[PDB]
Amino acid sequence: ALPDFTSDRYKDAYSRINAIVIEGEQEAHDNYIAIGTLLPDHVEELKRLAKMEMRHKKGFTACGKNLGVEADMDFAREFFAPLRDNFQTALGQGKTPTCLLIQALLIEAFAISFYHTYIPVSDPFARKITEGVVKDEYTHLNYGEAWLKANLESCREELLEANRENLPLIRRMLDQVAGDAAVLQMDKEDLIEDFLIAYQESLTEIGFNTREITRMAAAAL
Ligand SMILES: CCCCCC(=O)O
Ligand SMILES: [Fe+3]
Ligand SMILES: [Fe+3]
């Protein structure tokens, strides 16, 4: 059954979920622009992806306003801090494959899972917004898949390390979001399933075999 979008219980949980999505979109914008410093020949495409993220950010901001909710941005910034720090560390070292795995694979798969799971239980205003967004994140996933696929033989070991270090952070994020997500009528098992499906598919496209992907997904433990 659909949540009561007007309840204090719902608005409280939404204040944090809304913030997380808004912050995620802002960080995605910033990350794609940053990746442009590592891939200067990709700058126009990356700018395009970044602009899409700002469009998403504005749409989700409007979702919070529509429900009369003030987004808890401090909570959202802390929620993303561990992954953000790892992205910044990789960026500083010029580690493009790690930056792409964090943003274009892990974060996009996390977003795709959230949006897929939220849509069926969203209010009619937010539903339209979120339905516009999902196609876009598959484009972003495809962009990362394409670059990593083309460069796999030079960065396989780095990707294994990036996965080992960052997949557990996504798992922690899923654990942390689950309580509020449940108030929004979202099942944690659906979030996990959809995330792992999207990520496994990305890794398959990139050129990892079944054994490699199994070992990689197991890093979440
Ligand atoms: C769901 C929070 C993450 C959104 C990040 C993105 O749109 O790529
Ligand atoms: Fe986005
Ligand atoms: Fe995205």
Tab-separated table of C-alpha atoms and ligand atoms in Angstrom:
chain	number	residue	atom	x	y	z
A	1	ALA	CA	0.000	0.000	0.000
A	2	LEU	CA	1.089	3.560	-0.759
A	3	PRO	CA	2.468	5.563	2.171
A	4	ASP	CA	0.640	8.524	3.665
A	5	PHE	CA	2.748	11.265	2.072
A	6	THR	CA	1.345	13.860	4.479
A	7	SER	CA	2.209	12.104	7.750
A	8	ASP	CA	4.911	13.456	10.069
A	9	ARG	CA	6.426	9.959	10.057
A	10	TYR	CA	6.756	10.005	6.262
A	11	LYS	CA	7.999	13.602	6.071
A	12	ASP	CA	10.715	12.891	8.630
A	13	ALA	CA	12.045	9.873	6.731
A	14	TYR	CA	11.693	11.771	3.448
A	15	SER	CA	13.804	14.634	4.776
A	16	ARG	CA	16.769	12.284	4.886
A	17	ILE	CA	16.039	10.202	1.762
A	18	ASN	CA	15.384	13.351	-0.286
A	19	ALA	CA	18.660	14.831	0.972
A	20	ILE	CA	20.597	11.689	0.052
A	21	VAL	CA	19.267	11.718	-3.502
A	22	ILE	CA	19.908	15.463	-3.920
A	23	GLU	CA	23.461	15.131	-2.584
A	24	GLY	CA	24.044	12.069	-4.761
A	25	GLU	CA	23.089	14.015	-7.869
A	26	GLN	CA	25.299	16.945	-6.897
A	27	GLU	CA	28.234	14.629	-6.257
A	28	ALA	CA	27.599	12.866	-9.579
A	29	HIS	CA	27.731	16.260	-11.330
A	30	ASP	CA	30.986	17.101	-9.559
A	31	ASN	CA	32.464	13.661	-10.221
A	32	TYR	CA	31.831	13.734	-13.979
A	33	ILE	CA	33.347	17.223	-14.223
A	34	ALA	CA	36.336	15.955	-12.213
A	35	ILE	CA	36.768	12.949	-14.501
A	36	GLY	CA	37.070	15.479	-17.328
A	37	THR	CA	40.375	16.541	-15.776
A	38	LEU	CA	41.646	12.967	-16.151
A	39	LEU	CA	40.087	12.502	-19.598
A	40	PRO	CA	40.414	15.914	-21.300
A	41	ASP	CA	39.273	14.507	-24.658
A	42	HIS	CA	36.004	13.374	-23.017
A	43	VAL	CA	35.149	16.798	-21.569
A	44	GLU	CA	32.144	17.619	-23.765
A	45	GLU	CA	30.466	14.256	-23.126
A	46	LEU	CA	31.246	14.486	-19.407
A	47	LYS	CA	29.783	18.023	-19.297
A	48	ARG	CA	26.645	16.625	-20.877
A	49	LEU	CA	26.387	13.885	-18.239
A	50	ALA	CA	27.046	16.422	-15.479
A	51	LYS	CA	24.281	18.703	-16.769
A	52	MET	CA	21.877	15.759	-16.659
A	53	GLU	CA	22.753	15.231	-12.992
A	54	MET	CA	21.972	18.853	-12.189
A	55	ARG	CA	18.604	18.395	-13.912
A	56	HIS	CA	17.984	15.367	-11.656
A	57	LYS	CA	19.096	17.345	-8.610
A	58	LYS	CA	16.627	20.122	-9.346
A	59	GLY	CA	13.818	17.638	-9.920
A	60	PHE	CA	14.437	15.897	-6.607
A	61	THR	CA	14.695	19.222	-4.804
A	62	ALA	CA	11.221	19.978	-6.180
A	63	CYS	CA	9.979	16.623	-4.829
A	64	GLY	CA	10.967	17.654	-1.304
A	65	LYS	CA	9.372	21.087	-1.691
A	66	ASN	CA	6.172	19.488	-3.025
A	67	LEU	CA	5.759	17.381	0.112
A	68	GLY	CA	6.631	20.307	2.376
A	69	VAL	CA	9.849	18.705	3.522
A	70	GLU	CA	13.144	20.392	4.368
A	71	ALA	CA	16.010	18.205	3.121
A	72	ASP	CA	18.581	17.253	5.784
A	73	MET	CA	21.648	18.032	3.702
A	74	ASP	CA	24.122	17.624	6.569
A	75	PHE	CA	22.960	14.036	7.020
A	76	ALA	CA	23.332	13.444	3.265
A	77	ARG	CA	26.838	14.864	3.126
A	78	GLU	CA	27.932	12.547	5.951
A	79	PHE	CA	26.192	9.599	4.265
A	80	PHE	CA	28.316	10.110	1.144
A	81	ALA	CA	31.537	11.107	2.907
A	82	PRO	CA	33.305	7.719	2.859
A	83	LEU	CA	32.730	7.169	-0.864
A	84	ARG	CA	33.434	10.841	-1.627
A	85	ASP	CA	36.753	10.642	0.201
A	86	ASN	CA	37.765	7.559	-1.782
A	87	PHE	CA	36.820	9.260	-5.046
A	88	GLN	CA	38.880	12.335	-4.129
A	89	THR	CA	41.858	10.163	-3.184
A	90	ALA	CA	41.720	8.322	-6.523
A	91	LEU	CA	41.253	11.604	-8.420
A	92	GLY	CA	44.358	13.056	-6.760
A	93	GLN	CA	46.389	10.045	-7.864
A	94	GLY	CA	45.092	10.175	-11.427
A	95	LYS	CA	43.376	6.811	-11.032
A	96	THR	CA	40.720	7.124	-13.740
A	97	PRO	CA	39.514	3.494	-13.593
A	98	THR	CA	38.857	3.803	-9.851
A	99	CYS	CA	37.006	7.103	-10.309
A	100	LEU	CA	34.870	5.526	-13.025
A	101	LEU	CA	34.151	2.409	-10.989
A	102	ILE	CA	33.043	4.528	-8.029
A	103	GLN	CA	30.837	6.961	-9.949
A	104	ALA	CA	29.826	5.368	-13.224
A	105	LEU	CA	29.313	1.839	-11.867
A	106	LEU	CA	28.760	1.787	-8.094
A	107	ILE	CA	26.981	5.100	-7.605
A	108	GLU	CA	24.909	4.761	-10.794
A	109	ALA	CA	23.833	1.221	-9.817
A	110	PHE	CA	22.919	2.492	-6.337
A	111	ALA	CA	20.869	5.279	-7.947
A	112	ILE	CA	19.190	2.946	-10.463
A	113	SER	CA	18.214	0.623	-7.639
A	114	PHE	CA	16.846	3.451	-5.507
A	115	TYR	CA	14.839	4.963	-8.352
A	116	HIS	CA	13.495	1.588	-9.528
A	117	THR	CA	12.412	0.750	-5.992
A	118	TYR	CA	11.005	4.199	-5.123
A	119	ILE	CA	8.890	4.730	-8.274
A	120	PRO	CA	6.086	2.232	-7.426
A	121	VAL	CA	5.638	3.777	-3.967
A	122	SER	CA	6.156	7.443	-4.831
A	123	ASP	CA	3.636	10.294	-4.722
A	124	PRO	CA	2.212	11.346	-8.109
A	125	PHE	CA	4.466	14.442	-8.432
A	126	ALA	CA	7.659	12.581	-7.588
A	127	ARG	CA	6.671	9.603	-9.742
A	128	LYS	CA	6.828	11.666	-12.931
A	129	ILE	CA	10.178	13.128	-11.897
A	130	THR	CA	11.759	9.795	-11.031
A	131	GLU	CA	10.439	8.101	-14.206
A	132	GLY	CA	12.265	10.726	-16.271
A	133	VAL	CA	15.512	10.052	-14.400
A	134	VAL	CA	16.057	6.273	-14.734
A	135	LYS	CA	16.762	6.278	-18.485
A	136	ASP	CA	19.477	8.840	-17.820
A	137	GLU	CA	21.313	6.805	-15.221
A	138	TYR	CA	21.457	3.845	-17.624
A	139	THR	CA	23.177	6.218	-20.067
A	140	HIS	CA	25.715	7.009	-17.354
A	141	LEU	CA	26.207	3.347	-16.530
A	142	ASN	CA	26.713	2.733	-20.264
A	143	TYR	CA	29.352	5.459	-20.450
A	144	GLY	CA	31.391	3.911	-17.655
A	145	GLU	CA	30.898	0.415	-19.042
A	146	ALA	CA	32.158	1.553	-22.444
A	147	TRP	CA	35.363	3.168	-21.186
A	148	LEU	CA	36.233	0.376	-18.772
A	149	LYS	CA	35.460	-2.209	-21.475
A	150	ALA	CA	37.842	-0.498	-23.879
A	151	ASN	CA	40.597	-0.245	-21.256
A	152	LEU	CA	40.077	-3.438	-19.249
A	153	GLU	CA	43.372	-5.144	-20.023
A	154	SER	CA	45.331	-2.213	-18.594
A	155	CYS	CA	43.286	-1.687	-15.436
A	156	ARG	CA	41.923	-5.064	-14.335
A	157	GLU	CA	43.920	-5.196	-11.090
A	158	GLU	CA	43.009	-1.609	-10.210
A	159	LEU	CA	39.309	-2.373	-10.732
A	160	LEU	CA	39.534	-5.399	-8.448
A	161	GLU	CA	41.091	-3.188	-5.774
A	162	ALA	CA	38.587	-0.367	-6.305
A	163	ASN	CA	35.763	-2.878	-5.969
A	164	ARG	CA	37.228	-4.418	-2.811
A	165	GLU	CA	37.558	-0.975	-1.208
A	166	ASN	CA	34.282	0.591	-2.302
A	167	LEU	CA	31.643	-2.117	-2.668
A	168	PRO	CA	31.532	-2.500	1.161
A	169	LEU	CA	30.812	1.240	1.409
A	170	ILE	CA	27.745	0.815	-0.804
A	171	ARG	CA	26.641	-2.097	1.397
A	172	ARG	CA	27.016	0.139	4.456
A	173	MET	CA	25.015	2.848	2.698
A	174	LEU	CA	22.230	0.348	1.994
A	175	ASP	CA	22.243	-0.668	5.681
A	176	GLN	CA	22.107	2.965	6.775
A	177	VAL	CA	19.283	3.927	4.422
A	178	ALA	CA	17.086	0.913	5.130
A	179	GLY	CA	15.104	2.283	8.090
A	180	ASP	CA	14.005	5.467	6.344
A	181	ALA	CA	13.532	3.571	3.080
A	182	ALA	CA	11.115	1.229	4.864
A	183	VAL	CA	9.041	4.210	6.022
A	184	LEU	CA	8.859	5.106	2.313
A	185	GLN	CA	7.520	1.563	1.732
A	186	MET	CA	10.736	0.387	0.068
A	187	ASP	CA	12.019	-3.119	0.839
A	188	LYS	CA	15.764	-3.366	1.576
A	189	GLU	CA	15.936	-6.728	-0.202
A	190	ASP	CA	14.586	-5.072	-3.349
A	191	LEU	CA	17.225	-2.355	-3.080
A	192	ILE	CA	20.014	-4.909	-2.683
A	193	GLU	CA	18.736	-7.174	-5.468
A	194	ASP	CA	18.359	-4.371	-7.981
A	195	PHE	CA	21.737	-2.881	-7.106
A	196	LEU	CA	23.542	-6.205	-7.502
A	197	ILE	CA	21.754	-6.986	-10.768
A	198	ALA	CA	22.727	-3.620	-12.266
A	199	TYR	CA	26.307	-3.894	-11.030
A	200	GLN	CA	26.731	-7.538	-12.138
A	201	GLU	CA	25.407	-6.607	-15.580
A	202	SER	CA	27.856	-3.717	-15.822
A	203	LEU	CA	30.775	-5.951	-14.902
A	204	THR	CA	29.637	-8.513	-17.463
A	205	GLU	CA	29.516	-5.861	-20.183
A	206	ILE	CA	33.003	-4.679	-19.200
A	207	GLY	CA	34.335	-8.192	-19.776
A	208	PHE	CA	34.617	-9.849	-16.373
A	209	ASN	CA	33.737	-13.559	-16.277
A	210	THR	CA	31.306	-15.285	-13.896
A	211	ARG	CA	34.023	-16.340	-11.462
A	212	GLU	CA	35.529	-12.856	-11.372
A	213	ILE	CA	32.143	-11.246	-10.801
A	214	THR	CA	31.300	-13.705	-8.047
A	215	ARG	CA	34.550	-12.950	-6.270
A	216	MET	CA	33.896	-9.216	-6.726
A	217	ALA	CA	30.315	-9.273	-5.393
A	218	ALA	CA	31.620	-11.303	-2.447
A	219	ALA	CA	33.737	-8.285	-1.428
A	220	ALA	CA	30.521	-6.871	0.069
A	221	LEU	CA	31.006	-9.333	2.955
B	1	LIG	C1	20.683	7.973	-5.420
B	1	LIG	C2	21.827	8.867	-5.075
B	1	LIG	C3	22.891	8.791	-6.126
B	1	LIG	C4	22.542	9.504	-7.396
B	1	LIG	C5	23.777	9.568	-8.226
B	1	LIG	C6	23.576	9.671	-9.707
B	1	LIG	O1	22.550	10.199	-10.192
B	1	LIG	O2	24.453	9.237	-10.496
B	2	FE	FE	21.528	11.281	-11.611
B	3	FE	FE	23.978	9.452	-12.885
